[PDB]
Amino acid sequence: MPVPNPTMPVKGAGTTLWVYKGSGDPYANPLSDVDWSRLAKVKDLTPGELTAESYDDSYLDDEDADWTATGQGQKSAGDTSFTLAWMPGEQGQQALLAWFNEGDTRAYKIRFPNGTVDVFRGWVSSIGKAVTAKEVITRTVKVTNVGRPSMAEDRSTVTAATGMTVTPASTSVVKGQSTTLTVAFQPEGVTDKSFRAVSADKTKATVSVSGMTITVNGVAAGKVNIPVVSGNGEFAAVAEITVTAS
Amino acid sequence: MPVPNPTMPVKGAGTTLWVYKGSGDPYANPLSDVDWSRLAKVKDLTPGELTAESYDDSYLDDEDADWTATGQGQKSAGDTSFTLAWMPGEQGQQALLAWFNEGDTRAYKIRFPNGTVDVFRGWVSSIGKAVTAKEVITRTVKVTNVGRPSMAEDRSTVTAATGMTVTPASTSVVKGQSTTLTVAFQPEGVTDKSFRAVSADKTKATVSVSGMTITVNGVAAGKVNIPVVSGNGEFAAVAEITVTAS
Amino acid sequence: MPVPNPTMPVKGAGTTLWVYKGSGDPYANPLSDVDWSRLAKVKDLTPGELTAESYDDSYLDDEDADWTATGQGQKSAGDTSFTLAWMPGEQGQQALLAWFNEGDTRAYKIRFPNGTVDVFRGWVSSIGKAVTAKEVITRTVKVTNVGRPSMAEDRSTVTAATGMTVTPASTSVVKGQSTTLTVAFQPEGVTDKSFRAVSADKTKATVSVSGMTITVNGVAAGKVNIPVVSGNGEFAAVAEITVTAS
Numbered sequence A, B, C: 001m002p003v004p005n006p007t008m009p010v011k012g013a014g015t016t017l018w019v020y021k022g023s024g025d026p027y028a029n030p031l032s033d034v035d036w037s038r039l040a041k042v043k044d045l046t047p048g049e050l051t052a053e054s055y056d057d058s059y060l061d062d063e064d065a066d067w068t069a070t071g072q073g074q075k076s077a078g079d080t081s082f083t084l085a086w087m088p089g090e091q092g093q094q095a096l097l098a099w100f101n102e103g104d105t106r107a108y109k110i111r112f113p114n115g116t117v118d119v120f121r122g123w124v125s126s127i128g129k130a131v132t133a134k135e136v137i138t139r140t141v142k143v144t145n146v147g148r149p150s151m152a153e154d155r156s157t158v159t160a161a162t163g164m165t166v167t168p169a170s171t172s173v174v175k176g177q178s179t180t181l182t183v184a185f186q187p188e189g190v191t192d193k194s195f196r197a198v199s200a201d202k203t204k205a206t207v208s209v210s211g212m213t214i215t216v217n218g219v220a221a222g223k224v225n226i227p228v229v230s231g232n233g234e235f236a237a238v239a240e241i242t243v244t245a246s
Helices: A093-102 B093-102 C093-102
Strands: A018-020 A041-044 A080-085 A106-109 A119-123 A137-144 A178-184 A206-210 A213-217 A222-230 A235-243 B018-020 B041-044 B080-085 B106-109 B119-123 B137-144 B178-184 B206-210 B213-217 B222-230 B235-243 C018-020 C041-044 C080-085 C106-109 C119-123 C137-144 C178-184 C206-210 C213-217 C222-230 C235-243
Touching: A178 A235, A213 A222, B178 B235, B213 B222, C178 C235, C213 C222
Parallel strands: none
Antiparallel strands: A018 A106, A041 A080, A080 A137, A106 A119, A119 A137, A178 A213, A206 A213, A222 A235, B018 B106, B041 B080, B080 B137, B106 B119, B119 B137, B178 B213, B206 B213, B222 B235, C018 C106, C041 C080, C080 C137, C106 C119, C119 C137, C178 C213, C206 C213, C222 C235
């Protein structure tokens, strides 16, 4: 894949930011940074929790009601945490101290062992001296929200192909009327029941499969097209129904 | 929309006047000003409270009474407030000090985050040195009344379309007489009760809907016209009653 | 900067006046004083509130009206406050007591932690014994108005440089007539819409940008000059329109 699969390869190994302010794109290619500098180490890191607020905006379901005086607060979030470590010998906690003086938004990247290297932005939400015990100097900083470049159609739809031997109606229907495409089957040596035909156009038509028939409903004008393919291509049949403009 | 919707995106962000005296229209397009100059900053700004006086003119409901010696005061308002800030480095508080010397009516515009950029006029109702604490130099000025360009028919009336299958009376009535238009209904699979027919002309006629009938009242001569449309256009019927000139 | 930026470094730390009467400039360089003497301590100090009066001079918007008998009061202000402290061991409250006898206007300077060291003048608006509790001897004095040396053009105007590829009209217009400068654009890999050209001379001409064109209006005679520069200097084009003397 690229990133998304549900496997558990925990966390750790101490790789961490990797700050930048630079000039360029802070949400697309983060690997063009000229500032690109290690600050320290990580002990381990919280998940990426934004979190939220994220009002509603208070729907109910009480008293009807007349007007009546709603509110909202939207203070977005929620500051995102992680736990640092540093060794005397590593050089960068002074540039964390400089962040307390600076007060500004600094961008950064963190390697995950979870299959990504995500981009962060944030401000100095905890600073100064840190817990020391087994010589590592350990504390936290808390940070902010990210862009989203994710599609949902592509990646594509699965094997919708429990086909059947359909006899097509192939005949015009009145606008808003339903019609039936008869199902034959010969399931020799097997005796199936998995069959489940799929319409091409759902915008202007719809279909229900029950009763040993395909009920196609002419929701709007033109052509409704149902391609019935079996399995891995061992059978295919195409049927349509034309739908009136009135 | 344009401006009017009931959402709460609070206030602030320090944008402020933007004074003019110029020449042109001080109540229609305020964005043709050649004087157009920032004075300072705003900390935040009061709502637009005029306020009022706005007498009555003292109706009652005591002693009948003979003549008897009423008064009025009408001193309109009421001076409208807001809270300024300024930094040494910003240049304009000297032109606020000049307003104390000048004494005159100055026009201005203020950006709101409330979806508008309203036009103000007013005079120097507070001046000189201001409260300083966190280096901003903060005070107030208080100002005056605005024009109104708002219609109420347009924006138009809502879906008055809980129709019914009416049988029309379609027959002349005497001037000032009432008449009945019978209601049939077939509400299959549903069993409604929402039905509520609407007259076109209310100037010279009126209608009451109760009792499973439409009582149309021939208030003045000519035609009274009742168009009964259902829902989204799934049924429509038109009925009229002619009303005598005598 | 020099002083003006909107940061909050609160107040306190007990540094305070620093009186003078001397001879020299009481509003430009206040650091040439030969009188220059600490009086005491400050607990903390009110912002610099003058305040005002600052009449108007009562414009309305009632009764038309014939002549009719207005007034004014202009009693400028408004006396400006601050809260003193003193320790037995500090030597200067006796010279505050002398101020009660003297009755006169005394000049002074106060260090702020707000990035300035502002100059004051005033008179003894509260005197004698003071509140003691945690051994500091604490009270107030109230004082008066200051000069203003602030420019507004300089500091200069921001990056007015959302340029465009203009084809210039470059042709004389009649006095008071409008004319159009056509806009081309090739925004490859980007698809912009930010473009917003700026005239040099607004005294004798004006310009509106809408409709995918630049409408330049020949308000008075000579040349109107529009320099269109993009961004950081990646494109530039200069266009003019000559305007008739009649």
